[PDB]
Structures are given as C-alpha cells and as structure tokens.
Design a protein around this ligand. Structure first.
Ligand SMILES: CC(=O)N[C@@H](C)C(=O)NCC#CBr
Length: 129
C-alpha cells in the first residue's frame, strides 16, 4: 500500500444507483469466471503496483487504470447500473496494456489471449431480459 501508487478505482459508493441485470449476471458468472482462471490472468488480477515493478512512469502514462480485481469487486458488490459500464472497464484494462507496453511484450500476448476469450463471450452476451 505505497503512497506512490494511486488509490484503486472506486468499488463502493452509496451515491451511485445500482441495478442487477441478467447481462451483469452473465458478466460475473461466465465472462469474469472464464478470464479469471486463465493461465495468463495473474498480471491482471489486481491494480498495477508500479512501485513493486519499478515502473514510476506507469501512472504518468495510464490515467484511467483498471484491472480484473477491481472488476470482480464491482460485479460481486454490484456497483454497476448496466453491462456497458462493465464492458467498458474490461476494454479499458486491455487498451491500457496495449498503450503502455511494447507490441512484442509477454504482457501484451497475455492480454491478447484474454481479450480473444472476452470477445467470444461478449458476442454471446444475452438479450437484456
Ligand atoms: C497490466 C500491465 O500492463 N502490467 C505491466 C505494467 C507489466 O507487468 N509490465 C510488463 C513489462 C516490463 Br517494462
């Protein structure tokens, strides 16, 4: 919990209206479940600890951080109003990785594997019931 890392994204706020939808249930039970247990998930399971990794420029570059630990908390503590908000958090996580890291890099190949699974699952996101 270094003072040099920012506070994580919000996962609890009583002022924000919340709703359970069948699409948000799918995102937790199918999408997050699938990606969390992937061999390459672990770099994405918590906020980037730029101190531990000796990357002092990370939060100079990435101004909208997101990770699957935060998404999991948001889904489990239903923070979201709709599926689009959660889909945007996944998209942000992937795009941050591709912006910060070189296209060669192991971390980018890991994110691409997770994004390929993600796209397959989101194409099947159920009709809002
Ligand atoms: C989620 C994410 O982008 N993590 C990054 C910061 C990471 O682990 N870097 C790989 C390298 C070397 Br320089």
């Amino acid at each position: 919990g270094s003072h040099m890392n920012p506070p994580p994204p919000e996962t609890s706020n009583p002022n924000k209206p919340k709703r359970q939808t069948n699409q948000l249930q799918y995102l937790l039970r199918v999408v997050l479940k699938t990606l969390w247990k992937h061999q390459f998930a672990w770099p994405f399971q918590q906020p980037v600890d730029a101190v531990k990794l000796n990357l002092p420029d990370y939060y100079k570059i990435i101004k909208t951080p997101m990770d699957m630990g935060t998404i999991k908390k948001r889904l489990e503590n239903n923070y979201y109003w709709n599926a689009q908000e959660c889909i945007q958090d996944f998209n942000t996580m992937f795009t941050n990785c591709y912006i910060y890291n070189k296209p060669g890099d192991d971390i980018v190949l890991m994110a691409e594997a997770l994004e390929k699974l993600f796209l397959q699952k989101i194409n099947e996101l159920p009709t809002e019931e």
